[PDB]
């Protein structure tokens, strides 16, 4: 019923990225419209062209806009 060679893709998402059968990032890129791609876990300030200032709110984990 269950085999470790082909883990359920959803059951594996609940585990730690290093104890997985293959180690992989937990981060990604996404698109935002003020057309610009931004890192999911941004920590440094980010600026956008028409913008006059920063639009990121750094946090412990995922950023906010």
């Amino acid at each position: 019923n269950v085999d470790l060679l082909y883990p359920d893709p959803v059951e594996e998402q609940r585990k730690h990225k290093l104890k997985r059968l293959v180690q992989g990032p937990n981060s990604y890129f996404l698109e935002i419209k003020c057309i610009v791609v931004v890192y999911s876990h941004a920590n440094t300030p980010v600026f956008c062209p028409g913008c006059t200032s920063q639009i990121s709110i750094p946090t412990g984990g995922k950023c906010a806009f």
Binding site: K17, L18, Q23, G24, P25, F29, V38
Partner: protein, 153 residues
């Protein structure tokens, strides 16, 4: 936190299996190559350079694109610093502790931390002296640390 403490966490980064660039990549290695110079010309450490590239320019890994790491590029362009960054930051922390201690000399935790930092510095400096990355004559001393910090920085 293992070598000079008792804790043992495991906070690290796991890079992807595939070495290829993104399918939205629009930079030839040249564009990144000169960008490094501009940040280097402003006295920026390699780690901050990587963070800047990853955040603003959306480049997760430089090696996947140029085929080489940042410090190798800097050395090939003759801009790499004489002291590796980690040792330099170690020495900065040692200097700050020493100054705080000269200000007041009743704090003992500070002395304990200073002992640990000096031990780490000596180990790393010995390792770097081997591998011929530093001159054999290089030596770390408490009383003239700030001079070697500023002159070589």
């Amino acid at each position: 936190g293992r070598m000079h403490s008792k804790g043992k966490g495991i906070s690290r980064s796991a890079i992807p299996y595939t070495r290829a660039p993104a399918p939205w990549n629009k930079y030839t290695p040249e564009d990144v190559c000169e960008q490094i110079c501009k940040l280097a010309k402003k006295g920026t450490p390699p780690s901050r350079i990587g963070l800047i590239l990853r955040d603003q320019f959306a480049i997760g890994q430089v090696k996947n694109v140029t085929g080489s790491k940042i410090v190798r590029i800097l050395k090939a362009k003759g801009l790499a610093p004489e002291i590796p960054e980690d040792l330099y930051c170690m020495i900065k922390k040692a200097v700050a502790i020493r100054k705080h201690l000269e200000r007041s000399r009743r704090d003992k935790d500070s002395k304990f931390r200073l002992i640990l930092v000096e031990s780490r510095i000596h180990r790393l400096a010995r390792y770097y002296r081997q591998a011929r990355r530093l001159p054999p004559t290089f030596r770390y001393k408490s009383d003239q640390a700030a001079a070697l910090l500023a002159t070589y920085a």
